RNA sequence: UGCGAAAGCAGUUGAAGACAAGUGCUUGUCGUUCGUUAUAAAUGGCCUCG
């Protein structure tokens, strides 16, 4: 997951997730949490659909 | 309740409803990077069969690990055998030994079957 | 997110005695007949050769003390259980009784028999006795109060009495091994002087161990057998040693896996250890230049590094040793809740692993041809690229000046059995994608020619181990 | 440590104890003093050397949503 | 009556903050502890400490959310490269057993500029097109250079840069209207 | 004597249509924001965010 | 694609519509349909907390 730091065109990575990233969203007030949604395309005979709440201050699983 | 995800072990809880556990049971390129374009064309070992013994204490995977295509070795696949054991206050299951190609080279372990708890308490197991 | 995983890459018993790596030889005037250690802290050792008996730090490994009175040759440097008192032998046949590491005392002398006086040996529960035996072929026991005549005098061997052991837990018991190859074990309770019984060796006894109070192990000859007293019979014999045994020492209850070790030594330059609880079997021996006549190991509670002499009959000793802002200290004893997080630095990365993790395809396979580079962590980094997928990959930007140190290695690879598959995949790609190169490149022709004439001698091999294996079938 | 009693209530049968945790804050309990022991030390769990457990950790750091990695 | 008498501190008191509304005082020093003390002014009983191993605190500040009066928060900084924030709000203060606290490691490309986070004040920043109002968290460079910060979230939101070496900054607000 | 009884859940729903891309997510956090709702294809599930626990 | 063992044994990869380009004709494509068991290539590589 890249947050691109658009002022200066910078960017922010946060790398191993389970799975590959099919949504983002900052979800709060001011922007506490990233809510994602992850795939898992090992599994080719289903869809195996993750979501994960990370707190955006130290990018930790606040809910998995 | 464990799902043999491929390369990895869901142990989820059916009477909570929630996952316990996703651990990596094989090598391979499972979380060292996300495979891109024609990396995704690489399969990662798949686990092919998961048993328990009647102790509850060991843990016996199978596994078959394919080759890169494109390769003079392309077509022989390996097939290994881990026995993984883990103290029941613990989560996480330790592998203890391995056996590359079991029962002879590019030959599947179709069957296992672990021992009644007559035969070495529980602690033996069959493949064939 | 987790962590990026790493990049993956004998016996117990025989691992813990390569740990005696650092080796020391020091040089005597004449064969170390006898070693002894000091049961107590610091464990020093004494070594009796030529008309000397030399005591030797632990920690330093030097001569810390030296007994030089002796005239004539010493036979024996064995110190009392409290290690302040050591008893030597004469070929004079002059027992002398000195204070350890006050050599210029002698507290008592004794006359044991105008023969040579090859063993005398401190009893071990009781501290006034001390056993001496000579080539009279009486095996003395004096006592330190009593320096006029022996408490007890034991007879009845036929030849030379030069092995005495005390056994532990029945110190009423003695044993006394001659070179009639016979072991008598005599009571001190009773008159004495008459054994209880004999145990024939067949083989002259070089010397008589009691490694535990019911067995006693019997070195004599080529081969060192055990005796059980309650069966009174040899349990156990082990005969692997060549030459004639001469030397063994016990150790048990210490830091090693094994509780406890036997060495013997052979007189073939081999000392080898053996755990009595594995039926007396092998698990280790090294190898000295000559004749071993003497081992000892460090006892239990060395505390410290453990040492293991090996004494040879040109004088030479050999020691192998296994080694053994006010507030910033504060930790938090007196606080409601302290906070951990502070994670240890993962262990430092090769160059190979830090150009997998980065993507660097083509320089982790540069950094596998390199000089002084293991070659089984050769061997892992390019698995890793076939595992990656990455072989082409690694190949495409390359010509002749970079594609020699991957086939020179394969030159060396192809005869591995561990590296023939993995050598014949790089190798069959390259051809695959450096067709015209090769054409214009003569180095490389040449890399082949000698590639082709070893890749030959491999499939030679190779029906020839088919050829071994189907004649091995018919055998069973 | 002995946390002081500052007031006490004894209606019929029950006995109410207050005392102060942390600073000022007042906590109660009500116990039956016809059954209890001539002495009796009433036992109470505060914090004290209470090592911090993130609900988003396990005991080694590693964060929950992530997977075991293969060690072998 | 001394504050830090009833639990002495192990270290010098490199840092002093009361509450903004509470009767509250937070010290800090070396010792590495958050010691917060309850100022009577006779008593000065301890409410809470919090030790954080191997984060010497150069200093510590309250935070309380200008819009959310609810919202309370400690922040705290030394000699490292980290800074960690406690949430007080609810019960996290006296009745959990456990604190919630938060590092801040992140400064999104513009670690060559920031070498610590010892030096840091806490600010108010209206969002003025939203209207919405925020604290930012304010830190000193190695080059002239400030760095401001979320101080929730944790973002860079903007760096200002002066001649010379950085000494010291302060904070002034000026009332635009209602 | 025997009977059947679904007990455990299933996957987490989504919204599955194809032309609509970054609103898939149907899960929500409360106004006070102490604990996230997440439909499944059989029920909803509300887990509190402090504790990480399914609350109901 | 079917079967089978992993080796292998058999069998497929068609038609229409629309768009673009070149010169009614040619070629290529399809977030278009019907039917059959049925190279890549936008300089673009994975965080910090010793």
Request: no cysteine; net charge negative.
């Given at each position: 997951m890249s947050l691109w730091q658009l002022e200066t065109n910078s960017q922010q990575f946060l790398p191993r997730l389970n799975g590959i990233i099919i949504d983002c969203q900052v979800l709060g007030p001011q922007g506490n949490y990233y809510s994602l949604i992850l795939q898992?395309?090992?599994?080719?005979?289903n869809s195996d659909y993750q979501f994960l709440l990370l707190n955006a201050s130290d990018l930790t699983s606040k809910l998995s | 309740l464990y799902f043999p995800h491929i390369s990895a072990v869901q142990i989820f809880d059916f009477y909570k409803n929630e996952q316990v556990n996703y651990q990596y049971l094989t090598s391979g390129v499972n979380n060292s990077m996300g495979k891109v374009r024609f990396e995704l064309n690489l399969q990662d070992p798949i686990i092919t069969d998961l048993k328990f013994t009647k102790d509850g204490q060991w843990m016996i995977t199978y596994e078959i690990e394919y080759p890169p295509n494109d390769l003079l070795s392309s077509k022989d696949l390996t097939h290994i055998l881990k026995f993984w054991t883990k103290n029941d206050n613990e989560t996480n299951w330790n592998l203890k030994t391995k056996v590359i190609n079991p029962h002879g080279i590019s030959v599947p372990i179709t069957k296992i079957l672990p021992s009644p708890r007559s035969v070495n308490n529980s602690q033996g197991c069959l493949t064939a | 997110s987790t962590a990026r995983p790493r990049i993956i890459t004998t016996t117990p018993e025989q691992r813990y005695w390569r740990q005696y790596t650092s080796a020391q030889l020091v040089k005597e005037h004449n064969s170390v007949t006898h070693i002894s250690f000091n049961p107590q802290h610091p464990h020093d050792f004494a070594v009796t050769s030529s008309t000397r008996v030399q005591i030797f730090s632990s920690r330093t490994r030097q001569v810390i003390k030296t007994f030089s009175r002796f005239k004539d040759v010493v036979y024996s440097a064995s110190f009392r259980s409290d290690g302040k008192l050591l008893c030597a032998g004469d070929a004079t046949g002059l027992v002398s009784v000195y204070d350890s590491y006050n050599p210029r005392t002698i507290l008592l002398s004794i006359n044991a028999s105008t023969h040579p006086t090859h063993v005398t040996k401190f009893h071990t529960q009781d501290n006034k006795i001390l056993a001496t035996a000579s080539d009279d072929r009486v095996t003395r026991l004096w006592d330190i109060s009593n320096a006029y005549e022996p408490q007890l005098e034991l007879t009845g061997a036929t030849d030379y009495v030069r092995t005495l052991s005390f056994i532990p837990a029945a110190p009423h018991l003695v044993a006394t091994g001659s070179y009639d190859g016979l072991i008598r074990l005599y009571d001190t309770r009773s008159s004495g002087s008459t054994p209880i019984y004999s145990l024939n060796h067949d083989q002259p006894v070089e010397n008589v161990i009691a490694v535990s109070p019911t067995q006693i192990v019997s070195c004599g000859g080529n081969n060192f057998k055990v005796w059980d007293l309650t069966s009174n019979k040899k349990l156990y014999e082990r005969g692997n040693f060549n030459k004639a045994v001469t030397c063994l020492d016990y150790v048990e209850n210490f830091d090693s896996p094994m509780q406890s070790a036997l060495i013997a030594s052979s007189l073939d330059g081999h000392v080898k250890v053996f755990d009595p609880l594995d039926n007396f079997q092998v698990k280790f021996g090294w190898k000295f230049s000559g004749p071993v006549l003497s081992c000892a190991v460090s006892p239990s509670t060395a505390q410290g590094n453990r040492h293991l002499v090996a004494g040879l009959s040109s004088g030479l000793l050999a020691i192998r040793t296994k080694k053994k802002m006010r507030g910033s200290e504060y930790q938090g004893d007196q606080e409601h809740i302290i906070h951990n997080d502070k994670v240890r630095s993962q262990r430092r990365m090769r160059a190979f692993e830090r150009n997998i993790n980065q993507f660097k395809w083509s320089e982790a396979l540069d950094n596998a041809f390199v000089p002084g580079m293991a070659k089984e962590l050769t061997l892992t980094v390019l698995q890793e690229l076939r595992k990656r997928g990455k072989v082409r990959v690694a190949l495409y930007g390359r010509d002749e000046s970079t594609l020699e140190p991957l086939l020179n290695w394969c030159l060396k690879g192809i005869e591995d059995v561990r590296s023939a598959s993995i050598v014949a995949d790089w190798v069959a790609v390259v051809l695959e994608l450096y067709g015209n190169t090769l054409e214009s490149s003569p180095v490389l022709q040449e890399l082949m020619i000698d590639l082709k004439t070893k890749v030959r001698h491999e499939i030679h091999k190779s029906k020839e181990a088919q050829r071994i294996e189907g004649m091995l079938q018919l055998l069973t | 440590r002995k946390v002081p009693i500052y007031n006490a209530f004894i209606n019929k049968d029950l006995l109410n104890v207050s005392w102060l945790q942390n600073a000022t804050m007042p906590y109660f309990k009500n116990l039956q003093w016809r059954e209890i022991p001539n002495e009796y030390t009433v036992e109470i769990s505060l914090n004290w050397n209470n090592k911090n457990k993130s609900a988003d950790r396990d005991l080694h750091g590693k964060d929950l949503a992530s997977a075991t990695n293969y060690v072998e | 009556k001394d504050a830090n008498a009833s639990h002495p501190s192990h270290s010098a008191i490199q840092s002093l903050s009361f509450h903004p509304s509470k009767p509250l005082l937070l010290t800090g020093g070396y010792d590495k502890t958050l010691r917060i003390y309850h100022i009577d002014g006779k008593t000065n009983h301890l409410v809470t400490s919090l030790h954080l191993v191997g984060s010497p605190i150069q200093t510590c500040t309250f935070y309380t959310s200008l819009s959310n009066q609810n919202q309370q928060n400690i922040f705290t900084a030394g000699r490292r490269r980290y800074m960690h924030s406690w949430d007080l709000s609810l019960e996290n203060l006296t009745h959990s057993q456990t604190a919630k606290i938060e590092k801040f490691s992140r400064l999104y490309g513009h670690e060559s500029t920031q070498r610590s986070f010892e030096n840091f004040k806490v600010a108010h920043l209206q969002n003025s097109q939203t209207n919405s109002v925020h604290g930012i968290v304010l830190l000193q460079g190695n080059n002239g250079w400030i760095n401001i910060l979320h101080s929730t979230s944790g973002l860079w939101l903007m760096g200002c840069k002066i001649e010379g070496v950085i000494t010291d900054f302060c904070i002034d607000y000026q009332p635009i209207s209602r | 004597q025997y009977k059947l009884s679904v007990v455990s859940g299933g996957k987490p729903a989504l919204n599955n249509l194809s032309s609509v891309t970054g609103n898939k997510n149907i899960a929500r956090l409360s106004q006070d924001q102490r604990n996230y709702i997440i439909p499944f294809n059989n029920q909803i599930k509300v887990y509190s965010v402090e504790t990480r626990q399914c609350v109901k």
């Open positions: 898992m395309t090992e599994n080719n005979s | - | - | - | - | -």
